[PDB]
Ligand binder design. Structure first.
Ligand SMILES: NC(=O)c1ccc[n+]([C@@H]2O[C@H](COP(=O)(O)O)[C@@H](O)[C@H]2O)c1
Ligand SMILES: [Mg+2]
Lengths: 184, 183
């Protein structure tokens, strides 16, 4: 009877870090969604199982944030259309809110089958005070605190031996260090 | 009048390969109990092949879907952890864990069975008149006996024996097209 309102945040999460969690939590809470899943892609190569373990530790203590593993099980290079075709078929009770960066919204016409895809999901853009919100696609907008941490920067910091504390959750740091990830 | 939880079946197994008895079990268990859906859940040859056969087997049946969480974790997956994640992923869902009646008496040896039994409802597949010592509450579903096992299919394929009607036609094709099981 409940039509579930569930956010989806895609990406590689290579590794997961603070901005991923703030984006997901704030976008979903600000819109009043029921839950947000971080959905790691299989190939955008650090092992998928490593990225999955880090993610699960990152959202461990938070019932609001869960992990959606379908792209890691399906393997290959699942296009977003195929992923939400299967997710909407598995979950006919669910309205999906696909959360993307405001800078990603201008590349929407490059997405495979984007026209069919806007029929399956609701696109949620993260507003940047550095651009308009105008676009042909049916996108709704949310504000979230600017957290300018990138996984690229995190990886080089790890390679150089620089601190990543508080930029990355403690248990994720522990896993990175125990497993020697990212040239550690 | 209030919120109805969705009522969802889960059939675990290896599905190496999926065959007609898997499909009869999932469909009979779910329809006879009035469930909303049944998911076949392969445990963790290549996992991608088992996945592709499962998806082919259930393509034309919107009642049967595939649950791939155990393939994604990529490791020995204890039913407790699996059902932990799914109930937390789907707190609005009552889960029905379908197992063969012949495994039902072995449930108390499962990892953390007593937290599991508060997390799901066990459904016991049974041929009428089957008896077993099971002093755990179980939802029993009668199903015609269909004595098809993946071991027999695999070796039928390894011997060139026919498997028509024991295995869905689209699964036979994919097996053939891929050289699966030493064909
Ligand atoms: N009507 C339905 O098919 C229905 C209802 C409630 C929950 N679900 C959930 O949908 C999930 C399927 O999603 P994934 O295959 O991507 O994990 C299943 O785990 C199941 O618990 C399905
Ligand atoms: Mg009867």
């Amino acid at each position: 009877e409940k039509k579930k309102q569930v956010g989806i945040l895609g990406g590689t999460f290579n590794p997961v870090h603070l901005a991923h969690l703030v984006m997901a939590e704030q976008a979903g809470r600000n819109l009043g969604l029921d839950r947000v899943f971080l959905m790691p892609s299989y190939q955008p190569t650090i092992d998928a199982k490593h990225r999955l373990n880090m993610l699960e530790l990152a959202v461990e203590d938070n019932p609001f944030l869960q992990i959606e593993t379908i792209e890691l099980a399906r393997g290959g290079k699942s296009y977003t259309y195929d992923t939400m075709k299967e997710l909407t078929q598995n979950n006919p009770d669910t309205d999906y809110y696909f959360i993307i960066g405001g800078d990603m919204v201008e590349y929407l016409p490059k997405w495979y089958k984007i026209d069919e895809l806007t029929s399956m999901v609701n696109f949620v853009g993260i507003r940047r005070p550095g651009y308009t919100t105008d676009t042909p696609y049916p996108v709704i907008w949310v504000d979230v605190p600017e957290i300018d941490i990138s996984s690229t920067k995190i990886r080089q910091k790890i390679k150089e031996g620089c601190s990543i504390r508080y930029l990355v959750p403690d248990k994720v740091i522990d896993y990175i260090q125990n497993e020697g990830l990212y040239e550690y």
